[PDB]
Design a protein around this ligand. Sequence first.
Ligand SMILES: [Cl-]
Ligand SMILES: [Cl-]
Ligand SMILES: [Cl-]
Ligand SMILES: [Cl-]
Ligand SMILES: [Cl-]
Ligand SMILES: [Cl-]
Ligand SMILES: [Cl-]
Ligand SMILES: [Cl-]
Ligand SMILES: [Cl-]
Ligand SMILES: [Cl-]
Ligand SMILES: [Cl-]
Ligand SMILES: [Cl-]
Ligand SMILES: [Cl-]
Ligand SMILES: [Cl-]
Ligand SMILES: [Cl-]
Ligand SMILES: [Cl-]
Ligand SMILES: [Cl-]
Ligand SMILES: [Cl-]
Ligand SMILES: [Cl-]
Ligand SMILES: [Cl-]
Ligand SMILES: [Cl-]
Ligand SMILES: [Cl-]
Ligand SMILES: [Cl-]
Ligand SMILES: [Cl-]
Ligand SMILES: [Cl-]
Ligand SMILES: [Cl-]
Ligand SMILES: [Cl-]
Ligand SMILES: [Cl-]
Ligand SMILES: [Cl-]
Ligand SMILES: [Cl-]
Ligand SMILES: [Cl-]
Ligand SMILES: [Cl-]
Ligand SMILES: [Cl-]
Ligand SMILES: [Cl-]
Ligand SMILES: [Cl-]
Ligand SMILES: [Cl-]
Ligand SMILES: [Cl-]
Ligand SMILES: [Cl-]
Ligand SMILES: [Cl-]
Ligand SMILES: [Cl-]
Ligand SMILES: [Cl-]
Ligand SMILES: [Cl-]
Ligand SMILES: [Cl-]
Ligand SMILES: [Cl-]
Ligand SMILES: [Cl-]
Ligand SMILES: [Cl-]
Ligand SMILES: [Cl-]
Ligand SMILES: [Cl-]
Ligand SMILES: [Cl-]
Ligand SMILES: [Cl-]
Ligand SMILES: [Cl-]
Ligand SMILES: [Cl-]
Ligand SMILES: [Cl-]
Ligand SMILES: [Cl-]
Ligand SMILES: [Cl-]
Ligand SMILES: [Cl-]
Ligand SMILES: [Cl-]
Ligand SMILES: [Fe+2]
Ligand SMILES: [Fe+2]
Ligand SMILES: [Fe+2]
Ligand SMILES: [Fe+2]
Ligand SMILES: [Fe+2]
Ligand SMILES: [Fe+2]
Ligand SMILES: [Fe+2]
Ligand SMILES: [Fe+2]
Ligand SMILES: [Fe+2]
Ligand SMILES: [Fe+2]
Ligand SMILES: [Fe+2]
Ligand SMILES: [Fe+2]
Ligand SMILES: [Fe+2]
Ligand SMILES: [Fe+2]
Ligand SMILES: [Fe+2]
Ligand SMILES: [Mg+2]
Ligand SMILES: [Mg+2]
Ligand SMILES: [Mg+2]
Ligand SMILES: [Mg+2]
Ligand SMILES: [Mg+2]
Ligand SMILES: [Mg+2]
Ligand SMILES: [Mg+2]
Ligand SMILES: [Mg+2]
Ligand SMILES: [Mg+2]
Ligand SMILES: [Mg+2]
Ligand SMILES: [Mg+2]
Ligand SMILES: [Mg+2]
Ligand SMILES: [Mg+2]
Ligand SMILES: [Mg+2]
Ligand SMILES: [Mg+2]
Ligand SMILES: [Mg+2]
Lengths: 171, 171, 171, 171
Amino acid sequence: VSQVRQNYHSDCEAAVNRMLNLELYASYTYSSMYAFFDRDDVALHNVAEFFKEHSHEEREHAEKFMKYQNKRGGRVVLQDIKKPERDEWGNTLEAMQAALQLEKTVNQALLDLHKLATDKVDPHLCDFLESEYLEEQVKDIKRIGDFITNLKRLGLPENGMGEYLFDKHSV
Amino acid sequence: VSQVRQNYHSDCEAAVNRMLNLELYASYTYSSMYAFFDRDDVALHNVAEFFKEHSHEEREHAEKFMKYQNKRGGRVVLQDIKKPERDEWGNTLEAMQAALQLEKTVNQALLDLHKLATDKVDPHLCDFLESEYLEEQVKDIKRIGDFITNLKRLGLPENGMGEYLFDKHSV
Amino acid sequence: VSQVRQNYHSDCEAAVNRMLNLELYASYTYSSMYAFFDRDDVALHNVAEFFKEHSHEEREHAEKFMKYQNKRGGRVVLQDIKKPERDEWGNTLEAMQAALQLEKTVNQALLDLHKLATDKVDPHLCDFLESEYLEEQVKDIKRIGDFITNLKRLGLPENGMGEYLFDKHSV
Amino acid sequence: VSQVRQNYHSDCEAAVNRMLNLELYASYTYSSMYAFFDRDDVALHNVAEFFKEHSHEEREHAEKFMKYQNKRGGRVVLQDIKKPERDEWGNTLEAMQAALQLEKTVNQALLDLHKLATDKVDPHLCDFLESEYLEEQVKDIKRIGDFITNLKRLGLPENGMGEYLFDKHSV
Ligand SMILES: [Cl-]
Ligand SMILES: [Cl-]
Ligand SMILES: [Cl-]
Ligand SMILES: [Cl-]
Ligand SMILES: [Cl-]
Ligand SMILES: [Cl-]
Ligand SMILES: [Cl-]
Ligand SMILES: [Cl-]
Ligand SMILES: [Cl-]
Ligand SMILES: [Cl-]
Ligand SMILES: [Cl-]
Ligand SMILES: [Cl-]
Ligand SMILES: [Cl-]
Ligand SMILES: [Cl-]
Ligand SMILES: [Cl-]
Ligand SMILES: [Cl-]
Ligand SMILES: [Cl-]
Ligand SMILES: [Cl-]
Ligand SMILES: [Cl-]
Ligand SMILES: [Cl-]
Ligand SMILES: [Cl-]
Ligand SMILES: [Cl-]
Ligand SMILES: [Cl-]
Ligand SMILES: [Cl-]
Ligand SMILES: [Cl-]
Ligand SMILES: [Cl-]
Ligand SMILES: [Cl-]
Ligand SMILES: [Cl-]
Ligand SMILES: [Cl-]
Ligand SMILES: [Cl-]
Ligand SMILES: [Cl-]
Ligand SMILES: [Cl-]
Ligand SMILES: [Cl-]
Ligand SMILES: [Cl-]
Ligand SMILES: [Cl-]
Ligand SMILES: [Cl-]
Ligand SMILES: [Cl-]
Ligand SMILES: [Cl-]
Ligand SMILES: [Cl-]
Ligand SMILES: [Cl-]
Ligand SMILES: [Cl-]
Ligand SMILES: [Cl-]
Ligand SMILES: [Cl-]
Ligand SMILES: [Cl-]
Ligand SMILES: [Cl-]
Ligand SMILES: [Cl-]
Ligand SMILES: [Cl-]
Ligand SMILES: [Cl-]
Ligand SMILES: [Cl-]
Ligand SMILES: [Cl-]
Ligand SMILES: [Cl-]
Ligand SMILES: [Cl-]
Ligand SMILES: [Cl-]
Ligand SMILES: [Cl-]
Ligand SMILES: [Cl-]
Ligand SMILES: [Cl-]
Ligand SMILES: [Cl-]
Ligand SMILES: [Fe+2]
Ligand SMILES: [Fe+2]
Ligand SMILES: [Fe+2]
Ligand SMILES: [Fe+2]
Ligand SMILES: [Fe+2]
Ligand SMILES: [Fe+2]
Ligand SMILES: [Fe+2]
Ligand SMILES: [Fe+2]
Ligand SMILES: [Fe+2]
Ligand SMILES: [Fe+2]
Ligand SMILES: [Fe+2]
Ligand SMILES: [Fe+2]
Ligand SMILES: [Fe+2]
Ligand SMILES: [Fe+2]
Ligand SMILES: [Fe+2]
Ligand SMILES: [Mg+2]
Ligand SMILES: [Mg+2]
Ligand SMILES: [Mg+2]
Ligand SMILES: [Mg+2]
Ligand SMILES: [Mg+2]
Ligand SMILES: [Mg+2]
Ligand SMILES: [Mg+2]
Ligand SMILES: [Mg+2]
Ligand SMILES: [Mg+2]
Ligand SMILES: [Mg+2]
Ligand SMILES: [Mg+2]
Ligand SMILES: [Mg+2]
Ligand SMILES: [Mg+2]
Ligand SMILES: [Mg+2]
Ligand SMILES: [Mg+2]
Ligand SMILES: [Mg+2]
């Protein structure tokens, strides 16, 4: 094994690789949402840029897991980044709903990884997840939920004026 | 009695203690409104922060009465701060209506205290209320009334777009 | 349940509400100590301001729990804020002793909440308590203990000169 | 009568003259206390300067009454400024006790004047007293009371070390 490796279970190393892939998958889904809202027949540029920013955030999350893997003496193993579930995202409300579910999926994987780290008695990995991922995840989920509440209030999906107003005053 | 005490009636001392409690009660009601508008299923953050600010204002009012009591040689006596009348506040219009009534309740108590001070021939207490409370109270009541008129104009409670617009352009 | 809610046990939600109340209770006790030391027949203004600052600190702790509750999709439920155990606080030593016991009471509640969070496998709540409460609590307890040792050294409660010196050189 | 005179009762004009004299009397008493604490066999220079400052404050109060009298069309009438009640002031505690009683005497005269103004339906004179005198009077009485409490705590009159400490840390 690696000269630096200490208290790092094989199961955790593997789960970190899977988590890295999931972050990349989330990044790619957000990239797709960006492209959709940038379409001339959708044209909600502030919404598009919100999703573009989130795409970059998730890529940063993945890169941080790569650095982590090496810090612990694990080995980064990459798999295909699957294309997003949809090619088009309907409207701001549908996209935000998809984003909420994606964020809860990523959150569940983080929590599962934390449970594994706990079971394997790895406090460094626990600390890493708590300090670098779990709170940002809760914050993002709350932001998206807040947005969804406001989009519903604004009459989405039917109310195009409401959709315009959201893009101009919320993002 | 206190070495500093001069022209300070026992009834006024007691009424100052009751007034202090009422300010704390008002603070707590506003805290509740803050928490409500911060909910993910309510999500009107500018409205929430308006009420949070008012919560702090009312706490400051209470602290000023504590300092006053001691300046006159009276003794601060605290009672329980009762929880607010409601656990949830409906919407921006219902909350503002509740805030207006709360402010008029606090105003009536200030005016009653001023009448007591007048009856007991206490010009210092009269001056204190006039200079530190009565005008801020009138200003706050006018602001909230103005808000209510605008919320009605915007179609509250039914018009969610109107509610969004208020949060984005009035607070 | 709330659209944002994930891995948040009902027992933890309820315990957060109780913790919030306890912080408000601690705030109110410190407010009482402030008013006491501000009395013309007590007149230890640096001591009074120490307790006033702590009163504001505890209110901030409570507000942070409100924000937390909403972030997790729980619902803030308020109860009466009970008046402090005493109406007068004796002297600097008695007040500091009461403050130490209050701080240990608040600390025990935080630790109990952390244990509940651990049992319910909620690392986000664990992190929150560790990062935002538990160390400040230990620091405050140590500061107050240090003060008590010094007040005893200075001959409290009997030595009024010692009490004056503390107010002028320690706070 | 004066071309400017309006709603200014002869009794109020006379009472303003008496009030002016009392302020000058208070100034002179404080001047005496200054000189006493500046003595080589007393030598508490911070205490001396406190009383010197108060002497100037009271002279300013008197001058403001002169300006007031003329503003209303009354006529300033001066009488002898009586020498202070004592030629020597014992110690810091005795002097502060004398200062407290002097301040309460001045306060009573202000309150009596306010009552006269009220009876004669003179709101300008009421406002003047409330805005320029009554609160400063309450503040000064509280400060002196606080000092007395601390001087007693420090073991005055017997405890010379306590007296030294007060001069060095309270004024
Ligand atoms: Cl290992
Ligand atoms: Cl180990
Ligand atoms: Cl292993
Ligand atoms: Cl792997
Ligand atoms: Cl890191
Ligand atoms: Cl694959
Ligand atoms: Cl999807
Ligand atoms: Cl599709
Ligand atoms: Cl998903
Ligand atoms: Cl896992
Ligand atoms: Cl562990
Ligand atoms: Cl984080
Ligand atoms: Cl929002
Ligand atoms: Cl929004
Ligand atoms: Cl009285
Ligand atoms: Cl009177
Ligand atoms: Cl009375
Ligand atoms: Cl009372
Ligand atoms: Cl004030
Ligand atoms: Cl009660
Ligand atoms: Cl109500
Ligand atoms: Cl309710
Ligand atoms: Cl009300
Ligand atoms: Cl009253
Ligand atoms: Cl009056
Ligand atoms: Cl005001
Ligand atoms: Cl308005
Ligand atoms: Cl608009
Ligand atoms: Cl408005
Ligand atoms: Cl849950
Ligand atoms: Cl879970
Ligand atoms: Cl549950
Ligand atoms: Cl509860
Ligand atoms: Cl926080
Ligand atoms: Cl209760
Ligand atoms: Cl106690
Ligand atoms: Cl008591
Ligand atoms: Cl306790
Ligand atoms: Cl608990
Ligand atoms: Cl856990
Ligand atoms: Cl902390
Ligand atoms: Cl210390
Ligand atoms: Cl110390
Ligand atoms: Cl006239
Ligand atoms: Cl008239
Ligand atoms: Cl006349
Ligand atoms: Cl005259
Ligand atoms: Cl003036
Ligand atoms: Cl004469
Ligand atoms: Cl005398
Ligand atoms: Cl003499
Ligand atoms: Cl006198
Ligand atoms: Cl008079
Ligand atoms: Cl009048
Ligand atoms: Cl004044
Ligand atoms: Cl003092
Ligand atoms: Cl002092
Ligand atoms: Fe980032
Ligand atoms: Fe992520
Ligand atoms: Fe994310
Ligand atoms: Fe932990
Ligand atoms: Fe941590
Ligand atoms: Fe304020
Ligand atoms: Fe108020
Ligand atoms: Fe108010
Ligand atoms: Fe607009
Ligand atoms: Fe703080
Ligand atoms: Fe606390
Ligand atoms: Fe505390
Ligand atoms: Fe002055
Ligand atoms: Fe004066
Ligand atoms: Fe004076
Ligand atoms: Mg090797
Ligand atoms: Mg392996
Ligand atoms: Mg495929
Ligand atoms: Mg953190
Ligand atoms: Mg006494
Ligand atoms: Mg009484
Ligand atoms: Mg009840
Ligand atoms: Mg004013
Ligand atoms: Mg829902
Ligand atoms: Mg529950
Ligand atoms: Mg009770
Ligand atoms: Mg820390
Ligand atoms: Mg003429
Ligand atoms: Mg005349
Ligand atoms: Mg004579
Ligand atoms: Mg004033």
